[PDB]
Amino acid sequence: MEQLSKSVKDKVLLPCRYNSPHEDESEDRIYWQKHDKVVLSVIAGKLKVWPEYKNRTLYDNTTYSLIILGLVLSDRGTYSCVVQKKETYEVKHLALVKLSIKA
């Protein structure tokens, strides 16, 4: 569980911590989620950002990491980065990031 402390209005990069010789844009499905919400997905290399996060997030293609712009208090919490392969779903990678925020 990596932990980051930022302030309201900061931008932040949440590291997915994914790096293995089995990275494969074809099969790799990458998801960032927070609680019962999905932030974004990357399927076949194509990015899809959920409505709540459109215009306030970026994706770093190099590291599969999530960038959030203009933090607000409700952005606090645990985020997950998941790399899966659908065959049946199989998970290749799971990483958790705890974002703490104050004003």
What is the total count of domains within the chain?
Answer: 1
By residue range, what is the domain housing residue 85?
1-103
Residue 38, C-beta contacts closer than 8 angstroms, at least 6 positions apart: 31, 32, 50
Residue labelled with tokens 């960032």 = 32
Euclidean distance between CA atoms 42 and 62, whole angstroms: 13
Please report, for the domain that includes residue 15, its CATH number.
2.60.40.10
CA atoms within 13 A on the CB side of 6: 23
For residues 32 and 39, is the Cβ–Cβ distance under 8 A? yes
Resolution of this model in Å is 1.8
Q: Which amino acid is at 53?
A: Y
22, 87, 93, 94 from 58: Cα distances, Å: 24, 28, 20, 20
Tokens linked to 49: 């950002």
What are residue 73's phi and psi, to 5 degrees? -55, -35
